[PDB]
Amino acid sequence: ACPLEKALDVMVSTFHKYSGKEGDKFKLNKSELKELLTRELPSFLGKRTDEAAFQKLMSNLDSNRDNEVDFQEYCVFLSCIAMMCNEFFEGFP
């Protein structure tokens, strides 16, 4: 009935699907971020699944510099992706 509320639930559940695998269950480490990105957001990195790309992404996302991505930082990341899609919604910039 409410696709946007369902979308939010997917955002929440997908985080935990990977954040709970290793160490802090509420934060994504490098390995968990790698798996989330490759499996759940393959269109984002595309062919850039190398270690250099993942280190750059980690540094971009880890705003509080604790070496992991928490839920707030993850939401900022997803917001950035949405904003990029927003820029091309009309079929031109």
Residue numbering of the annotated binding site: 27, 32, 62, 64, 66, 68, 73
Binding test (CB under 5 A) with Ca ion, winner from 34, 37, 54, 62? 62
Cβ proximity to a second copy, 58 vs 76, nearer residue: 76
Q: Which of Ca ion, a second copy, none does 50 bind, CB closer than 5 to 8 A by kind? A: none
Look up residue 1 and give its DSSP letter.
Answer: -
Q: Which of a second copy, Ca ion, none does 81 bind, CB closer than 5 to 8 A by kind? A: a second copy
Strand partners, 69: 28
Cβ proximity to a second copy, 52 vs 86, nearer residue: 86
What is the full DSSP assignment across 20-87?
A: TSSSSTTEE-HHHHHHHHHHH-HHHHTT--SHHHHHHHHHHH-TT-SSSEEHHHHHHHHHHHHHHHHH
